[PDB]
mmCIF file of C-alpha atoms (C1' of nucleotides) and ligand atoms in Angstrom:
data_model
loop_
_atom_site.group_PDB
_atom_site.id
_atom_site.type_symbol
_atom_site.label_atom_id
_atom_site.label_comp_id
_atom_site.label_asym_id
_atom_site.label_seq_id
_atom_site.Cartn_x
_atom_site.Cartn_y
_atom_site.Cartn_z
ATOM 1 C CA UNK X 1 15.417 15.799 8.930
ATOM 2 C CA UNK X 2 16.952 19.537 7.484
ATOM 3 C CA UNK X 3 20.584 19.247 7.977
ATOM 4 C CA UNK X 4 20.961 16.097 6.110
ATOM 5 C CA UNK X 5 17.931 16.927 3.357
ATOM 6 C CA UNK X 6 19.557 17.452 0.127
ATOM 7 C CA UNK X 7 21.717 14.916 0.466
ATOM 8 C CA UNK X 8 18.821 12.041 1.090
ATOM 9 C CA UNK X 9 16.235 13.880 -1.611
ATOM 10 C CA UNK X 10 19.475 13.507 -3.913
ATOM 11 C CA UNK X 11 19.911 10.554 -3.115
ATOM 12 C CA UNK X 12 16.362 8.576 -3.571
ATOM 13 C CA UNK X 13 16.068 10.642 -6.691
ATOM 14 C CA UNK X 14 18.902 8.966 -7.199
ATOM 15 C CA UNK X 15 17.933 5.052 -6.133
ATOM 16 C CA UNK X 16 14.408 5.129 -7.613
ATOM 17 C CA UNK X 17 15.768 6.028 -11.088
ATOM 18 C CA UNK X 18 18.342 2.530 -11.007
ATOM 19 C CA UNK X 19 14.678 1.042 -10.149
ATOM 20 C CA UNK X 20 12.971 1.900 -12.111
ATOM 21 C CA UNK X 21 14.630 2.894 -15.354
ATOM 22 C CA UNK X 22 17.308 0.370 -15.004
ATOM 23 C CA UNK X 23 16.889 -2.492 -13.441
ATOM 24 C CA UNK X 24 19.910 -1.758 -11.246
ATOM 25 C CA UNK X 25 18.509 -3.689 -8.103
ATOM 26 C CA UNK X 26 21.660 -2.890 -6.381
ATOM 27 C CA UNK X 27 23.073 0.525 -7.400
ATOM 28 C CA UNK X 28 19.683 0.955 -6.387
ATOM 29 C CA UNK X 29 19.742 -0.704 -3.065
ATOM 30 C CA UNK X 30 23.389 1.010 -2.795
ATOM 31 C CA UNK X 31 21.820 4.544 -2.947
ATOM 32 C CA UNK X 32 19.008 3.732 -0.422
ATOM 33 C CA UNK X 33 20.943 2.540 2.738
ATOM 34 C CA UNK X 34 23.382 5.309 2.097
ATOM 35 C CA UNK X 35 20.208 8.178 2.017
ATOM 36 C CA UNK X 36 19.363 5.963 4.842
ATOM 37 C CA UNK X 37 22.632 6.540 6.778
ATOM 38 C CA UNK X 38 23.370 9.859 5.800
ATOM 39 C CA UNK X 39 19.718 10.878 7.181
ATOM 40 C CA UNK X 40 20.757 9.595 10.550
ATOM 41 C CA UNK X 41 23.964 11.500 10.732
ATOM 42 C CA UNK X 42 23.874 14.594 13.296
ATOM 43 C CA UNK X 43 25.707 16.642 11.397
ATOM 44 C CA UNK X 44 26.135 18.753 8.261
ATOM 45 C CA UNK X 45 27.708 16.761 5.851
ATOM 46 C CA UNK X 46 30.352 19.427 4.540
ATOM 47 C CA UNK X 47 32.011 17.130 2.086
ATOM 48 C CA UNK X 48 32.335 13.571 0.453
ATOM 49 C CA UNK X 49 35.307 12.886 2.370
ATOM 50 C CA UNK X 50 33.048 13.473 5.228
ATOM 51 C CA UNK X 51 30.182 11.974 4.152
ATOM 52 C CA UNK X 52 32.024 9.059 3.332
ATOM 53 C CA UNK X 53 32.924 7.859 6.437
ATOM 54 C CA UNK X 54 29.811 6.227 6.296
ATOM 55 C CA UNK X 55 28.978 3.366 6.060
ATOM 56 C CA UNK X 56 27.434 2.354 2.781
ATOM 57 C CA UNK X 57 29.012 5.621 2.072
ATOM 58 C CA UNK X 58 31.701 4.619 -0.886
ATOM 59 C CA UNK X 59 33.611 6.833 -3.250
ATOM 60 C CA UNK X 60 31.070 7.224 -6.233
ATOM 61 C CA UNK X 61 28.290 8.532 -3.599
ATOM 62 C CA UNK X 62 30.734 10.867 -1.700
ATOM 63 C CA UNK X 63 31.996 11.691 -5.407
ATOM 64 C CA UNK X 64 27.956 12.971 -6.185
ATOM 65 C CA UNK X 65 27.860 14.728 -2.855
ATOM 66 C CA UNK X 66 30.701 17.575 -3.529
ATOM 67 C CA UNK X 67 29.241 17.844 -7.024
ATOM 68 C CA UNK X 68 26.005 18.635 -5.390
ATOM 69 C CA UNK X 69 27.418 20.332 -1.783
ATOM 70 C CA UNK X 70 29.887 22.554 -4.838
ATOM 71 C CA UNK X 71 26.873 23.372 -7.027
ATOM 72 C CA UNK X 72 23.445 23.332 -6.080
ATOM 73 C CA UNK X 73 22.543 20.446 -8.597
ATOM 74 C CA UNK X 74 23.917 17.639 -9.784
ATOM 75 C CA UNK X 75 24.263 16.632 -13.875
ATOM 76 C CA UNK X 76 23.090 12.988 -13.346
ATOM 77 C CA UNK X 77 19.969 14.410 -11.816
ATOM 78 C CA UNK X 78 19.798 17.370 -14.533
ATOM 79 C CA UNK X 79 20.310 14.412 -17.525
ATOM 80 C CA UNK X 80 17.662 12.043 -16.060
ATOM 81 C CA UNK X 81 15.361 14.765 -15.372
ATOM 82 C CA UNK X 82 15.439 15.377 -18.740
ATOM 83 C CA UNK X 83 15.362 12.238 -20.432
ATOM 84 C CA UNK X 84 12.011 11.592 -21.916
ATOM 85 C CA UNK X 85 12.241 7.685 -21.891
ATOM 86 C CA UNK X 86 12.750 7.734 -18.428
ATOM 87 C CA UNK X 87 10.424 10.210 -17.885
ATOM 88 C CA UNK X 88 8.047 8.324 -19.792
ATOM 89 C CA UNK X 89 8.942 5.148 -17.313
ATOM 90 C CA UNK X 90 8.283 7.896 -14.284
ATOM 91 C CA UNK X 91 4.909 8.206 -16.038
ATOM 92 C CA UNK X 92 3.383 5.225 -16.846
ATOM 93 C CA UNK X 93 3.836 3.675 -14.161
ATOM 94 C CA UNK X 94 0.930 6.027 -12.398
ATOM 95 C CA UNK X 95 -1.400 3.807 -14.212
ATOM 96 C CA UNK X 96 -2.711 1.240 -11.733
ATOM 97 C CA UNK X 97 -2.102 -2.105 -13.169
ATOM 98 C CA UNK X 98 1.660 -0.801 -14.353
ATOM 99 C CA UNK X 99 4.733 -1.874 -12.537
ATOM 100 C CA UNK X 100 8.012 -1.011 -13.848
ATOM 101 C CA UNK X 101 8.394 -3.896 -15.828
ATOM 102 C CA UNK X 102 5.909 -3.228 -17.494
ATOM 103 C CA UNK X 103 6.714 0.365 -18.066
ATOM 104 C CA UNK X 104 10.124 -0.564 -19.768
ATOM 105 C CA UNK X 105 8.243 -3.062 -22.341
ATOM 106 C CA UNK X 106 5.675 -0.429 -23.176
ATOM 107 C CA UNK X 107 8.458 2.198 -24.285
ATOM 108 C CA UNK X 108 10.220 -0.154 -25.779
ATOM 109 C CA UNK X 109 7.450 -0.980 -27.954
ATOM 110 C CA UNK X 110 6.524 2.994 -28.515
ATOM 111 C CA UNK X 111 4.410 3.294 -26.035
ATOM 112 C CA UNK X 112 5.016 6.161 -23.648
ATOM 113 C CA UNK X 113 1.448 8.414 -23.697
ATOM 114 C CA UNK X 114 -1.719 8.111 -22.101
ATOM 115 C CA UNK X 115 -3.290 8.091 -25.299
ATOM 116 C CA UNK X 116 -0.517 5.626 -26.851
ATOM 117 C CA UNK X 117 -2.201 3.269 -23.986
ATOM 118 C CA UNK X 118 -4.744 3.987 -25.392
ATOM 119 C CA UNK X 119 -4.528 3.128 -29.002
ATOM 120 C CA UNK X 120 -3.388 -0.068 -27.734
ATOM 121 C CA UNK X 121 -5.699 -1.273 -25.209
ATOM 122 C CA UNK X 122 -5.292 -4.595 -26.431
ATOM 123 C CA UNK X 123 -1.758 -4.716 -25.216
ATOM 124 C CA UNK X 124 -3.118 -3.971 -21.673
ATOM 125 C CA UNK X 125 -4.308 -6.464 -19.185
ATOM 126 C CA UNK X 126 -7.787 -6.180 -17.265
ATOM 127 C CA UNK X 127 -5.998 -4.331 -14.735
ATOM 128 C CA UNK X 128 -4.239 -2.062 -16.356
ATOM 129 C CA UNK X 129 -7.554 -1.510 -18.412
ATOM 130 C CA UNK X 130 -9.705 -0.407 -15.794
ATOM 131 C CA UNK X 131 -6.334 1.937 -14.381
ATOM 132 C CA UNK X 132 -6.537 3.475 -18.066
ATOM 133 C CA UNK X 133 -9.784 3.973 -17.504
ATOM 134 C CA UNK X 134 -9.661 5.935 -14.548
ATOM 135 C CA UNK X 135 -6.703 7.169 -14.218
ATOM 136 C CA UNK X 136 -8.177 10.385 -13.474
ATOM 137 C CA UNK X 137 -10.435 9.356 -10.632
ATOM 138 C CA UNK X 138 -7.861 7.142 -9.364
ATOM 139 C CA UNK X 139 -5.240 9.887 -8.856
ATOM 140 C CA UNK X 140 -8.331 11.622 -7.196
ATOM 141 C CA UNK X 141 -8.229 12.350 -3.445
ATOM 142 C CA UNK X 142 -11.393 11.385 -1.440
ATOM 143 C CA UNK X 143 -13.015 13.569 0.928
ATOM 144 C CA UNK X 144 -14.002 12.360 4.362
ATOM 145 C CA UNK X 145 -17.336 13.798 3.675
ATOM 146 C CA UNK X 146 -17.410 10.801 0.855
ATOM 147 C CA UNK X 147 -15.813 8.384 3.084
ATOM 148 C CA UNK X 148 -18.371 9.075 5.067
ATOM 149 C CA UNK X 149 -21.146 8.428 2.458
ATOM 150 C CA UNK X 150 -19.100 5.455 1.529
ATOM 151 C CA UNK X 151 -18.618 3.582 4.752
ATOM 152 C CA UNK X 152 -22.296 4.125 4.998
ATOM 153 C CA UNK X 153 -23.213 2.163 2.313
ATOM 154 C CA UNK X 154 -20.805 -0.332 2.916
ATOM 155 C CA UNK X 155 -22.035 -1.228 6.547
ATOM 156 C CA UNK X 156 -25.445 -1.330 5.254
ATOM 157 C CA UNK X 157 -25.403 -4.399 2.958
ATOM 158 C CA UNK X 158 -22.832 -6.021 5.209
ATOM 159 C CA UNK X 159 -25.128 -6.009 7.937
ATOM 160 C CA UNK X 160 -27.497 -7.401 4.974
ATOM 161 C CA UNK X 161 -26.498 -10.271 3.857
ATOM 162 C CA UNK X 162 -25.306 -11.345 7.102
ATOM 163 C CA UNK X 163 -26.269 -9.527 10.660
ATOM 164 C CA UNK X 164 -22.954 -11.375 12.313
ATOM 165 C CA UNK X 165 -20.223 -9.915 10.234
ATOM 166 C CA UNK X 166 -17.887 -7.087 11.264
ATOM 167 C CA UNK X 167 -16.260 -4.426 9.127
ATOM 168 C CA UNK X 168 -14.004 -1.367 9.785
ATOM 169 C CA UNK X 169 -13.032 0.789 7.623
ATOM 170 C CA UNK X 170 -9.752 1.462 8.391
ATOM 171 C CA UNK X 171 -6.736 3.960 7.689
ATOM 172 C CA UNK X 172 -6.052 7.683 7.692
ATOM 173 C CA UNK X 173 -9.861 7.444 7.512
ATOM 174 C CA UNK X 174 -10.396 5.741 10.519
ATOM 175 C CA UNK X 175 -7.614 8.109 11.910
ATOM 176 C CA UNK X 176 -9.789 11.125 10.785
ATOM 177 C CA UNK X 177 -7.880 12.299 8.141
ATOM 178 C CA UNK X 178 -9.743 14.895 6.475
ATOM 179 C CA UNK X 179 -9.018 13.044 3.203
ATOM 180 C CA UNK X 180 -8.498 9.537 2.320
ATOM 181 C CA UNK X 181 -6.722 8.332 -0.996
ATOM 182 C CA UNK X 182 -9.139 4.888 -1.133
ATOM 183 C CA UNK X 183 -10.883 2.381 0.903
ATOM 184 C CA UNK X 184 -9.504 0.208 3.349
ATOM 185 C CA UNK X 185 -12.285 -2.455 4.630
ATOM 186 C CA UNK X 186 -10.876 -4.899 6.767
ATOM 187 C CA UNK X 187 -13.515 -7.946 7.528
ATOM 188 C CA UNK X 188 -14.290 -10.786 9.533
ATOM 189 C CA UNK X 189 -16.542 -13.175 11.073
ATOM 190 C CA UNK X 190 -17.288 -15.924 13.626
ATOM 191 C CA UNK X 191 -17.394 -18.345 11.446
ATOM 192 C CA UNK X 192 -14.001 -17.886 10.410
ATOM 193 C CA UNK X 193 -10.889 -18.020 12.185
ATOM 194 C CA UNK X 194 -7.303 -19.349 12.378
ATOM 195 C CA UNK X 195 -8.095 -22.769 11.802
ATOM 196 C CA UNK X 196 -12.246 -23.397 10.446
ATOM 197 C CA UNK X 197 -11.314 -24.334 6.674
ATOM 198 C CA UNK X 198 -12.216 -20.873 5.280
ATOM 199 C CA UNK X 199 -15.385 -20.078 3.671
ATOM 200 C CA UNK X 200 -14.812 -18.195 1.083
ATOM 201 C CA UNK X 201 -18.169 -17.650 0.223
ATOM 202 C CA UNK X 202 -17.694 -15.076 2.974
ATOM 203 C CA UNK X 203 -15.713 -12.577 1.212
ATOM 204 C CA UNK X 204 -18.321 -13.923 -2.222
ATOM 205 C CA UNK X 205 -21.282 -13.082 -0.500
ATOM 206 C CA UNK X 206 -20.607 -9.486 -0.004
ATOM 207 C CA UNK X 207 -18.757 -8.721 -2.812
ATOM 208 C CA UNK X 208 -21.851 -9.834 -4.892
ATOM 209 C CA UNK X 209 -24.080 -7.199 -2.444
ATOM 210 C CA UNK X 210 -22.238 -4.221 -3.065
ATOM 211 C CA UNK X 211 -22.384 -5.212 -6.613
ATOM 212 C CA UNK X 212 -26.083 -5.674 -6.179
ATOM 213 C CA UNK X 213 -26.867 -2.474 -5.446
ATOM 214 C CA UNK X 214 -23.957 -0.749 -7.935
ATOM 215 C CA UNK X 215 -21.639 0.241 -4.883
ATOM 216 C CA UNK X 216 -19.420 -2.220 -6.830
ATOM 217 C CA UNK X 217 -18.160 -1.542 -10.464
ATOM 218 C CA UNK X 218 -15.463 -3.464 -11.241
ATOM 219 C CA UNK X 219 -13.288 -6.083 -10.308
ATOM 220 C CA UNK X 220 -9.255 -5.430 -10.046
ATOM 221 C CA UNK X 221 -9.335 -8.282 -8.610
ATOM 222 C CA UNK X 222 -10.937 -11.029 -6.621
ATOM 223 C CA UNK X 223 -9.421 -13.728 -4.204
ATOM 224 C CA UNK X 224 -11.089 -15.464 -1.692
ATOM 225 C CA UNK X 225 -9.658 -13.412 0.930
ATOM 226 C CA UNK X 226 -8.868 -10.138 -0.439
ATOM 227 C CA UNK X 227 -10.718 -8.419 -2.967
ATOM 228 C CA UNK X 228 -9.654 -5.513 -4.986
ATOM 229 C CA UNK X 229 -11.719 -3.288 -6.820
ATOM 230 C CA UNK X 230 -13.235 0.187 -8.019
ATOM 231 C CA UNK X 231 -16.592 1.751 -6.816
ATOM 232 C CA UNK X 232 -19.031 5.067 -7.017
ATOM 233 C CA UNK X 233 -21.643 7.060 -4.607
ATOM 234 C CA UNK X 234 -25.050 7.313 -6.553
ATOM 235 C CA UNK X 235 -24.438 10.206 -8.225
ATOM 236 C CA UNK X 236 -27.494 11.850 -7.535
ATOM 237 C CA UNK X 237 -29.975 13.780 -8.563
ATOM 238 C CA UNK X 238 -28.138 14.723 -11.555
ATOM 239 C CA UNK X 239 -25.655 17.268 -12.442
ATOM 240 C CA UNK X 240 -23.205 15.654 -9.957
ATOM 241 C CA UNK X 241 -21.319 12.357 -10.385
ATOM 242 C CA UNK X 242 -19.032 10.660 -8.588
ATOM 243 C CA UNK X 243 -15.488 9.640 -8.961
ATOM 244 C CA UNK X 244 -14.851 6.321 -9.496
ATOM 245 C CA UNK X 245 -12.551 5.076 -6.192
ATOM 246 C CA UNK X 246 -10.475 1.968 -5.491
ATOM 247 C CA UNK X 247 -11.925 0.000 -2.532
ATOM 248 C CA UNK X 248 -10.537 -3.191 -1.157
ATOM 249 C CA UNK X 249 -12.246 -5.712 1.232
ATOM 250 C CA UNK X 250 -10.089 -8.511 2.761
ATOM 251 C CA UNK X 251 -11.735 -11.590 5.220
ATOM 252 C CA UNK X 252 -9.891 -12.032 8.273
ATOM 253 C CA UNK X 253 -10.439 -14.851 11.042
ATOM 254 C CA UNK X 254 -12.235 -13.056 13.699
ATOM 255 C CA UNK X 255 -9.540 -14.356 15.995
ATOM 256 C CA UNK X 256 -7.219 -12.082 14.314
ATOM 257 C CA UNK X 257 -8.906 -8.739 13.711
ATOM 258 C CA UNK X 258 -8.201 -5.757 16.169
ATOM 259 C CA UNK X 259 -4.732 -7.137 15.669
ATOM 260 C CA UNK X 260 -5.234 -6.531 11.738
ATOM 261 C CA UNK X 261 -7.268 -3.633 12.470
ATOM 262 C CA UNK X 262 -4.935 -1.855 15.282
ATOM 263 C CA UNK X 263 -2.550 -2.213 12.774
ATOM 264 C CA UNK X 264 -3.830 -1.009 9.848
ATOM 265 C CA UNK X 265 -5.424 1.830 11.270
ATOM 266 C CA UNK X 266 -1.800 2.792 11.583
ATOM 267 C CA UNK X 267 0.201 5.249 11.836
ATOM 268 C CA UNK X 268 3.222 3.731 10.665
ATOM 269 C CA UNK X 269 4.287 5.494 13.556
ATOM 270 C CA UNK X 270 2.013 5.153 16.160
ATOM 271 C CA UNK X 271 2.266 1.295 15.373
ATOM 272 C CA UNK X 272 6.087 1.398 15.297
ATOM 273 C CA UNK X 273 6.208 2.865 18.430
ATOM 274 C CA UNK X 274 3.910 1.284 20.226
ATOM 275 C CA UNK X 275 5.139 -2.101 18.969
ATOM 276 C CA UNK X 276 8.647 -0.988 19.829
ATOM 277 C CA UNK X 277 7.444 -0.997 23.428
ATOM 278 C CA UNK X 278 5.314 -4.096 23.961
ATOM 279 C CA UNK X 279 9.067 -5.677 23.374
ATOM 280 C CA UNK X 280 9.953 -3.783 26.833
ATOM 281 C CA UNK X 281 6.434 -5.093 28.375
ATOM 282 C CA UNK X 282 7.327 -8.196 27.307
ATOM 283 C CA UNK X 283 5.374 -8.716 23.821
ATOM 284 C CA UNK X 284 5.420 -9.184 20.835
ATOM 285 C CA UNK X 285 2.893 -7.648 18.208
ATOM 286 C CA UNK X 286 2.108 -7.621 14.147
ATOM 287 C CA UNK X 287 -0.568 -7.852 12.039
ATOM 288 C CA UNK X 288 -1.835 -10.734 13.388
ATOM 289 C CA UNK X 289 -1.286 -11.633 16.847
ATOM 290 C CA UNK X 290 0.405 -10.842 20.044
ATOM 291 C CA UNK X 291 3.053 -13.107 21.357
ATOM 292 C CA UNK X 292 4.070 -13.340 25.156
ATOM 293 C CA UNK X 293 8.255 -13.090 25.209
ATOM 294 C CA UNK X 294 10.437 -15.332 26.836
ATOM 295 C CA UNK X 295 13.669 -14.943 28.267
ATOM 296 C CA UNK X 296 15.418 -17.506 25.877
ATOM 297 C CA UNK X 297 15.831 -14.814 23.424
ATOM 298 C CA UNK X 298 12.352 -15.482 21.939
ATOM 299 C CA UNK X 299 8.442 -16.788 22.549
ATOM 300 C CA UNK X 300 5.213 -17.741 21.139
ATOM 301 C CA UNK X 301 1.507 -18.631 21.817
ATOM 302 C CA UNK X 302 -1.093 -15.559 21.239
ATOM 303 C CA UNK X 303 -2.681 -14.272 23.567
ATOM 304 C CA UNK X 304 -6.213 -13.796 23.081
ATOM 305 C CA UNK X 305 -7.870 -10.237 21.652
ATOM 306 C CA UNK X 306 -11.204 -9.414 21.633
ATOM 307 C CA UNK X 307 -10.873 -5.495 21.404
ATOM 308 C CA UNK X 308 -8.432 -2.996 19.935
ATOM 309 C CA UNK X 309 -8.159 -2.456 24.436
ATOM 310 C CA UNK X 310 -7.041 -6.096 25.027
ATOM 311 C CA UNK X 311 -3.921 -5.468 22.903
ATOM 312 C CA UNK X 312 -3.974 -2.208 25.237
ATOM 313 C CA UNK X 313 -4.105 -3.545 28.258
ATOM 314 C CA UNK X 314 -1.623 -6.634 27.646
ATOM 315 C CA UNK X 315 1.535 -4.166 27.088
ATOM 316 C CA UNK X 316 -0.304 -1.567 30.060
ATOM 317 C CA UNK X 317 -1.025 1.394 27.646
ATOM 318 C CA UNK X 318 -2.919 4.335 27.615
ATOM 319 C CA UNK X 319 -5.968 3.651 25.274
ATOM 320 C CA UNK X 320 -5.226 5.946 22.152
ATOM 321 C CA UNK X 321 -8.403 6.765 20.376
ATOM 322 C CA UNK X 322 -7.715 6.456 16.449
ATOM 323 C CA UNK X 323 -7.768 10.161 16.349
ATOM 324 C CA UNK X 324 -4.610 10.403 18.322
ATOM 325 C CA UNK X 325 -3.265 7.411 16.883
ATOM 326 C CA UNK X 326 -1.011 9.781 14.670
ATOM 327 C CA UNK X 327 2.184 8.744 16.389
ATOM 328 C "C1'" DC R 1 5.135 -9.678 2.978
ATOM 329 C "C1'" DA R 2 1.205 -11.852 1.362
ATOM 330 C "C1'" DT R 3 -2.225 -12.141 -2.135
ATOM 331 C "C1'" DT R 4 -3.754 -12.366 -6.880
ATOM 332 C "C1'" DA R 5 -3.283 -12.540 -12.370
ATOM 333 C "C1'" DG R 6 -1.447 -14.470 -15.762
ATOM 334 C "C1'" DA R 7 1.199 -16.731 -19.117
ATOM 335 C "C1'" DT O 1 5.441 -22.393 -11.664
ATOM 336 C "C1'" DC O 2 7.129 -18.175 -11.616
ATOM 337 C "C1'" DT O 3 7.076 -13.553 -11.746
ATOM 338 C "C1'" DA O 4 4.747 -8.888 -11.573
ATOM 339 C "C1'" DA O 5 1.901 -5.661 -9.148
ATOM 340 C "C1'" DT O 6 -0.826 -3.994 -5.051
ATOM 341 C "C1'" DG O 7 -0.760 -2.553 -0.368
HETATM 342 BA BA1 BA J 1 32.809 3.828 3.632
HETATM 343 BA BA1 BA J 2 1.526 1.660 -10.484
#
DNA sequence: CATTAGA
DNA sequence: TCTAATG
């Protein structure tokens, strides 16, 4: 967590550069469980030889750990660091709508500036043109107080168009985060579960309200189950306009919800943990449902959940508001 | 780890 | 269809 530090930060430098830059899917995978395993060891690595012990831990790893134990850097680091068409891979990328692979095409067309995007919108995809277009907003942070504004608005039509549907707005947000980086609406209703044929018209229906009323102002993309998009509070009475913030809204069978929602509303930890022990009370929990264990080495059939508290109850837990839902 | 765009 | 990109 400190002893080991370095060493991993080194390390998943390191990794993500074979990622990304190359497309060294194993050198890259290499780094990683090594960062991984080093991380876990309890003691001060004081050398490769050490180090390398390890398992995942081979001789060109060890090799980079005296250079960097011996000096504090590390050349490889210092070179990449400094190259500018990796950097420019680093960079691009930050534009929503730009993977890696598309990262390496753009440079190797010319490509590597904001602007450069720019002067080439054509080459750019819908996607990729609305993440142009706010990339500034989008790298944005957004206040609770906005959240706040924002999850108003959205329960409002919701309940609109149709009085039986169900939204949460989960996340860090619904975790009370004082800051949220977008919006994470998870929805459902009656009508729709495991098995009744969809109706996609569900997810449709509101989609086209928020739109309605300008809550809505683009379209990343748009599924009949999950959309994806960009939105913007009424900027006001002037002199004040909003930020233009990613949203996403995603239909769920209501049989499956508080499963969806318990998890999403995180931690990672929280959910680890608490999943790690439902295996001891003899469960079995994810995204979706919650599985009785049986001895044979493994179970099915889902139980049924009406309330984040159901899932409580079944593994005999202490109901954990969101708030202290951190871990 | 599943959903969407696209080509 | 596959393959990239999001989460
Ligand atoms: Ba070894
Ligand atoms: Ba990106």
């Amino acid at each position: 967590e400190t002893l080991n530090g370095g060493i991993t930060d080194m390390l998943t430098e390191l990794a993500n550069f074979e990622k990304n830059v190359s497309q060294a899917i194993h050198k890259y995978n290499a780094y990683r469980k090594a960062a991984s395993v080093i991380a876990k060891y309890p003691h001060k690595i004081k050398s490769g030889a050490e180090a390398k012990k390890l398992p995942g831990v081979g001789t060109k790893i060890a090799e980079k750990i005296d250079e960097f134990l011996a000096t504090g850097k590390l050349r490889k680091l210092e070179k990449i660091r400094q190259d500018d068409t990796s950097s420019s891979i680093n960079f691009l990328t930050r534009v929503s709508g730009i993977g890696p692979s598309a990262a390496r095409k753009f440079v190797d067309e010319g490509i590597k500036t904001l602007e450069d995007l720019r002067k080439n919108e054509d080459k750019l995809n819908h996607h990729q043109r609305i993440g142009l277009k706010y990339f500034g907003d989008f790298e944005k942070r957004i206040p609770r107080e906005e959240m706040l504004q924002m999850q108003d608005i959205v329960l409002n039509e919701v309940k609109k168009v149709d009085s039986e549907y169900i939204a949460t707005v989960c996340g860090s947000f619904r975790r009370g985060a004082e800051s949220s980086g977008d919006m994470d609406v998870l929805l459902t209703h009656p009508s729709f579960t495991s098995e009744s044929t969809k109706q996609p018209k569900l997810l449709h229906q509101v989609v086209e309200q928020l739109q309605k009323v300008h809550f809505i102002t683009d379209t990343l993309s748009k599924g009949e189950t999950k959309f994806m998009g960009v939105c913007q509070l009424p900027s006001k009475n002037d002199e004040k306009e909003y930020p233009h913030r990613r949203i996403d809204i995603r239909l769920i069978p209501k049989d499956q919800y508080y499963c969806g929602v318990l998890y999403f509303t995180g931690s990672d930890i929280f959910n680890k943990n608490m999943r790690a022990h439902a295996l001891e009370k003899g469960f079995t929990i994810n995204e979706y449902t919650i599985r009785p264990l049986g001895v044979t080495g493994v179970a099915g059939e889902p139980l049924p959940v009406d309330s984040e508290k159901d899932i409580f109850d079944y593994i005999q837990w202490k109901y954990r508001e969101p708030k202290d839902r951190s871990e």
